Every structure is written in C-alpha cells, then in structure tokens.
C-alpha cells in the first residue's frame, strides 16, 4: 500500500460492516490521522464532533489493525556475535 | 500384554494370511491403549541486536 491509511482502509474494507464503530473508524482513518499521531484526543473530538469516550473503543479497534502485515514474511535470522573475553565469576572469584 | 479370548477359524477372509480381527469390546475395554510423551524445548539465543 505504501500508505498507512490505504492499508488500514483496505483492512477495514475486508471486515464486515456489522461491527460497531466502523464508519467512524473509517472517517478517522480518512483524514483524522494527524490527531492520533499527536494523540490529540481533544482536538480530534473538536474537529470530527464524535461521541466523547465512545471513540475510545474505535481507537482500540484501530489499534487492532495489525500494522505492517507484511512483517510476518520476514523470518528471524540469528546474529552471530563472537565475543573476545569471557567472564564467569561462578561462586564469586571472577576470572577474566 | 493381556489374556484375550481367541479362536482359530477362517472368517470371510479377514484372517486371510496375517490379518487380525479385533473386538469392539476391547476398544470399549480400552485394552492395549497406549500413552506417549513428547518433549519440546526452546532457547533464547541472545543476539547482537
């Protein structure tokens, strides 16, 4: 998608409309991303004229959108770090 | 093992050469039921990152 709003919009469109706070979440994802970026809850409420504290559920649902879904493609690869000095200090008596 | 009632009689070919017919009672009696334990382990493997 190369755009967080675009990917979020596609993910929301994938789900059914029966879920509550769907249209409001879509509206927020459309052009209200800046307030969430700054966590401007009061400014977002003033602008979008949304229900107070009812938008918290929609915000949580938007947080449950799995950002960067392509990250699952990446597989873990160990980082081969070879140390030079080893210290044990077993039962005290530290010996480098 | 278990002491199971048997008989030496060809039953419709279900004991053709080396085929054994079993009783639903034995399954109900749960005889020869086996329990197996499997082990799985994991490590952290601290990395450079």
- Cα–Cα distance for residue pair A31/A36, rounded to 1 Å: 10
A79 interaction partners in chain B (CB closer than 8 Å): 47-49
Phi first, then psi, for residue A14 (nearest 5°) are -65, -40
Residues 1 to 49 of B: which have CB under 8 A from any A CB? 45, 47-49
Does an H or E element contain A48, and which? helix A41-48
Angle of CA points A33, A39, A45, to nearest 5°:
75
Instruction: Mark A8-27 as b/e (b = at least 16 C-beta within 10 Å).
Output: bbebbeeeeeeeebbebbbe
Question: Could you say which DSSP state residue B15 is in?
Answer: T
E strand spans, A16-91: none
Closest to A58 measured CA to CA, from A71, A41, A38 = A41
Closest to A39 measured CA to CA, from A22, A71, A23, A62 = A62
Resolution of the solved structure (Å) = 6.8
CB A68 within 8 A of CB A11: no
């Amino acid at each position: 998608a190369k755009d967080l709003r675009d990917c979020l919009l596609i993910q929301l469109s994938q789900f059914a409309k029966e879920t509550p706070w769907l249209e409001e979440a879509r509206l927020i994802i459309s052009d209200h991303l800046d307030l969430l970026a700054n966590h401007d809850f009061r400014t977002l409420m003033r602008v979008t004229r949304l229900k107070e504290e009812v938008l918290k559920e929609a915000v949580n649902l938007i947080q449950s959108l799995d950002p960067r879904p392509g990250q699952s493609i990446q597989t873990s690869e160990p980082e081969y770090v070879i140390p030079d000095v080893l210290v044990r200090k077993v039962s005290g008596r530290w010996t480098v | 093992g278990q002491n199971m009632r048997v008989a030496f009689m060809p039953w419709n070919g279900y004991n053709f050469e080396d085929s054994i017919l079993v009783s639903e009672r034995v399954v109900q009696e749960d005889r020869f039921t086996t329990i197996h334990i499997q082990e799985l382990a994991c490590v952290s493997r601290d990395t450079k990152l």
